Amino acid sequence: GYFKIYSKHTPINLVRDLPQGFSALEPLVDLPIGINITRFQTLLALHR
Amino acid sequence: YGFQPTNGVGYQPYRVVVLSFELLHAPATVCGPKKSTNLVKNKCVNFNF
Ligand SMILES: *[C@@H]1O[C@H](CO)[C@@H](O)[C@H](O)[C@H]1NC(C)=O
């Protein structure tokens, strides 16, 4: 019943591929909400 | 209703609120303030931080 979100921001100079490096992800937030999630979506910001 | 100042007991308007809780269904979010003591140092004590 806990939704855990961890996050990290990292500036990159390489163009496309993922970097050859290591960096931990510090915890961001916990939510005490009980939902039986099984699928999800994504949001985009288009130019109308 | 016929609430009037001259009315006696059993007729004067009353304001009543009933409070309801839940029993072990979701993680708690509203609870009584746990009391706190001060801090001692350099003494063999027991703590509940
Ligand atoms: C998981 O799904 C079941 C029904 O398939 C539901 O009864 C239960 O509450 C769900 N669990 C959570 C944490 O929402």
3-state SS of chain B is: CCCCCCCCCCCCCCCCCCCCCCCCCCCCCCCCCCCCCCCCCCCCCCCCC
Resolution in A for the shown PDB structure? 2.9
Residue A30 β-bridge partners: A4
Q: Are A5 and A24 in contact (CB under 8 A)?
A: no
Q: Which atom of ligand 1 is nearest to the CA of A35?
A: 14
Alpha carbon distance B22, B28 (integer Å): 9
Whether the CB of B36 is below 8 Å from some CB of chain A: the reply is: no
Experimental method: cryo-EM
CA distance B23 to chain A (A): 15
Pocket of ligand 1 (CB under 6 A): A 1, 34-36
Whether the CB of B27 is below 8 Å from some CB of chain A: the reply is: yes
